[PDB]
Amino acid sequence: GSHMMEILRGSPALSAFRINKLLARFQAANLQVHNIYAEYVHFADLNAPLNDSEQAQLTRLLQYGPALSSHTPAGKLLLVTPRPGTISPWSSKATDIAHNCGLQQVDRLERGVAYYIEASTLTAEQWRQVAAELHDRMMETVFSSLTDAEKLFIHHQPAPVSSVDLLGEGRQALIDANLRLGLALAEDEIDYLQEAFTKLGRNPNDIELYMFAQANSEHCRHKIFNADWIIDGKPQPKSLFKMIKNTFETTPDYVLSAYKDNAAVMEGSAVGRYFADHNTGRYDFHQEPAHILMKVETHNHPTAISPWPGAATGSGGEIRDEGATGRGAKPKAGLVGFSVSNLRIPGFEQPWEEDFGKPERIVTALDIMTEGPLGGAAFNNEFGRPALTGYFRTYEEKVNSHNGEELRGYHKPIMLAGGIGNIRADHVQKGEIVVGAKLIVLGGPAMNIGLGGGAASSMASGQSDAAADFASVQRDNPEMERRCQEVIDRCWQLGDANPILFIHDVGAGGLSNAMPELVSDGGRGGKFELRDILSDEPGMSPLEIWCNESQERYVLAVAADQLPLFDELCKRERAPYAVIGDATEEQHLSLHDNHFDNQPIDLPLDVLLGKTPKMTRDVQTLKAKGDALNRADITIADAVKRVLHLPTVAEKTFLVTIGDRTVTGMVARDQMVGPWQVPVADCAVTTASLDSYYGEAMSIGERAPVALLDFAASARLAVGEALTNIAATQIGDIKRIKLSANWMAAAGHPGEDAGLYDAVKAVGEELCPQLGLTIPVGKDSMSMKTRWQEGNEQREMTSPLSLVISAFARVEDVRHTLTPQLSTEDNALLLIDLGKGHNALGATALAQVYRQLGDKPADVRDVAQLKGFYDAMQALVAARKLLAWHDRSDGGLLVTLAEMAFAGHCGVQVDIAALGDDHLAALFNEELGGVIQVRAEDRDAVEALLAQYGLADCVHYLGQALAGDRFVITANDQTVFSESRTTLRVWWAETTWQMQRLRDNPQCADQEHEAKANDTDPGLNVKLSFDINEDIAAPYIATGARPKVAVLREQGVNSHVEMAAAFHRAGFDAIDVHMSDLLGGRIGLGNFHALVACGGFSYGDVLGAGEGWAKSILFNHRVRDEFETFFHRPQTLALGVCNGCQMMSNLRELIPGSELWPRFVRNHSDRFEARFSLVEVTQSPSLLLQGMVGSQMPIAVSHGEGRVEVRDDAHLAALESKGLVALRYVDNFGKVTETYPANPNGSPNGITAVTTENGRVTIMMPHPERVFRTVANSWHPENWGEDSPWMRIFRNARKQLG
């Protein structure tokens, strides 16, 4: 009923560098702005009053963030808020916090930014340009009063169903509805619906038509992939889908599920799966097969409109598909892909770049590469999966391709998200759905988001309208999805008692696709009640309820008798759920509305799900002639410089360190390699469990520009490069490697349809069967083109046919993986040239950087040799004969060699006289293959091994890696190219420099860049004060007496399992203690002598990282007392890591000896930092760091709010003089530092761990529990065994308890 809104003023919102960025942009647009100041403002919509104690609680909940200096407001107020009718994810999370702090009076919290602008003239026109700079027009609105925020909370009554009057108007009623609702129905679909509803004798409701329209969109139905074809006048025998399935028919080996779920599954390894038992709450290893699931998809349309949520929800949706595999499974690691047009970075424009214009209503390529990666990472970080491999291509050029001179590019981008997960053997096959099964929606209360995303993603970009653009603006709440994943995990961890009978993602078409798909897959019908669906928008129509594409939702069926167990599981995780229907024997779909007393849907399923006829595509081959590369302005030296400046080639740190690479404690090989943490790893590798060296690998291959000359060569190169990227990982049989094939095309663009067919046939009927590669999963995105008016003229930007191949494989031993990090021991560099001397230059980075396409591209030259290459590499890996590997891809041999020299921080001396007279072609061709490094004494044996696989004539001794800074390429006695390695490495870094500079704190960006120019940097290096191998806990463990540790987690924590496992190894019984367990009386801290607060994103860090977790404790007097009691005991030990460190810092008042502790706030860079950082252990009372003082070693860092902040210099000095600092960032020279990224977060005096006066409580931002295994350390000394130095923390805890 009646509500009231409270306004609570917040903290200053913008740091000085962001304030200056705005002032410079106003200056640059001739807007005389003299000053700008911004404060956060909070809006609390209340359903009943707060007493003084409750109000002070709310005020305290709304104190967070860096303590920037406050100003009295002056000048003109512009308030930026979410647009009315939308609810921010901030609101969802901040409101949860208020509820878990016992403020049930809060209906909703929302936040805005109040800007105060002091300006000169400014016409009201100039005031609109000011407002335009301060907000995102796709998600936010600008208001002139704080009281205008009342508009965000308006109560709306439910809108009724609308019927479409077929009986009273005939077919015209359907034609009109088609246009009005944007159904995009073909004529034969209108005929089908006309007849269906004629036969039923009643008018269709809007909801029924909309549901049908989204289900029959290209995006949902895959008509092109199921079409018959005629090509150059000849009917073809197979659909594209069937050509793909041919690879499964040929190679079924190791596959457990293909084309039957939203993920493929393959065999894994029998290992210890580590999780907490349902009955005891104790973490234990369960020895069993951990099979491997895989999936890759895209989110291309929405990302062109709103890239952050487009990227974020692309990850989100893919992660739902993984979790919804079989009867429930567990996402493990991600991959990420982007293809965009030229960046045209201001002040850093490159010579191949020309501005060709774009639609007004899509964003730029730069804006996609700025906001998009941050959204994808935001999801992966908050959900808690590491992101370990990826690609990033730029391409935008006017080229003479298959359809003559045209603009080819990515104005509509590729935004790709994928991953692998683990699954139990008895959960791979979907279960049957019993009649009477309860049909549940797990996850977030819905809103009117993304409505018609199925149809909207089935058409070209540009030339839209405002309403369809708003409907392309997605919304992500990763913490909601983590809560759901926890429920799914509890389910599958019940084994034979998993109550999930069937589960599926909620994606395109929303419930309208997902619920009918679910009952249909079980051979049932369903009857549903509209008003049982959770809603955050009471105004929605039945059509909006049923069809919206709100995020973080799953559908599942459970037996009625398992509902009480399901409800327990949900409530413990705080995962919202609703029973919304029942499965029926009758194959009918009914949706009832208790509010309006009527029946929005009443359809037989065969009517609803029936199909118009199959498509037939009758198309013609076009083939580009292609022109020899004009080398007039090309020199080797200039080409080097340009190629290292192509983003596709250039260093990718901007995309890498924004995303967590260590969550789970199972990451063995991330993108960053070696002591200088250079992002060149060719594939990702994870361990299968926390107790095994078996694992999983991921790689990507893609080569779209090649499809501008040769469709089939492009698809063969994508598969070949996926293989050459994975090949130095210990796999064995090539049939263990499984592919996802993701096809992006502008279907209908001249030449592309035939090209697509040819390319699918090239890999599905030919190459993959001949190699023994299965493609058990895949997807397609068939409208990769953008049209707009540029002056008086029509313009179009069409993508090349763009196949992205992801490769997945069970790994036999993760320890044996090679990287590009050159050794300088005596060595030989050998090139494996799978190009057989073809040395093609067409559609290379070289061609692109001189604005050309060239003549003939690379291609798979010899299938047997490609297989022999793989098998030879597997032989060399297993026999431990390789020091290094790096494959050849974008940028050619030149770039492979350069990148190895960068990773090894060394030089090379190579001769290319054997690779042909054309040195430009030898160095810049992008033929398959790469460079191995071997010990000099092994050269002859390695060459004989290669020869056994038929490769002798492709193998060429190049030379050696050498200490120092010289990169030298000779041919006989001539120097072909010679340059400082450091100069080349800096050039190769300039793209990430400029991206980080424009996106992050430019001071940090500059510091990181400039460090790369100092060749004397020794890289990460270790000094140990103790014996890493000495298990000081062993005598305790040998008694069999295992003390408990409370492994504490809140909603949104994601780092608890590996924390449990670290303590386990040290001899503890690790107990899963959720904050709901404490609030419910199921666990009491009095039964524990040790507690650990784990990492993650509790409440999505809304209201300050760790703050909602801590304030939930403080505001419940019972739980508050419990924690105080624990910390005031004389012998108890507690550890807070990352989110747990932040939480415990906010609980100071309960912890003795903590009065000098700092706060932890937004990093100085203004960016999430996923780093492998060097720290030193400093002298303090900390009992957990005993024996380790003076040690220096690297550790996993993964945080956005890790900066120590003190009240004033007095506080810093007091802390330091008390001697409570326990860890500090050091640079690679070993000195305490504040320079970035050696110190990733800007903490004064490098501080990143503190302890209490008694030593019994220690808090730290880095993650020792992610790196307690040597194998999980991105770089480490070669002589280490199983345990890293960090294992000593947990062993210290065990010894301390006695």
Ligand SMILES: Nc1ncnc2c1ncn2[C@@H]1O[C@H](COP(=O)(O)OP(=O)(O)O)[C@@H](O)[C@H]1O
């Ligand atoms: N979009 C991205 N997100 C995350 N990591 C990425 C991304 N693009 C590239 N990377 C990573 O950066 C490194 C270099 O990428 P790239 O040069 O494209 O690989 P390659 O040439 O071996 O195919 C790799 O470790 C790759 O996984």
Ligand SMILES: NC(=O)CC[C@H](N)C(=O)O
């Ligand atoms: N991994 C973590 O615990 C991170 C803590 C918090 N979400 C941050 O980013 O600062």
Ligand SMILES: [Mg+2]
């Ligand atoms: Mg590369």
Ligand SMILES: [Mg+2]
């Ligand atoms: Mg590579």
Ligand SMILES: [Mg+2]
């Ligand atoms: Mg690549």
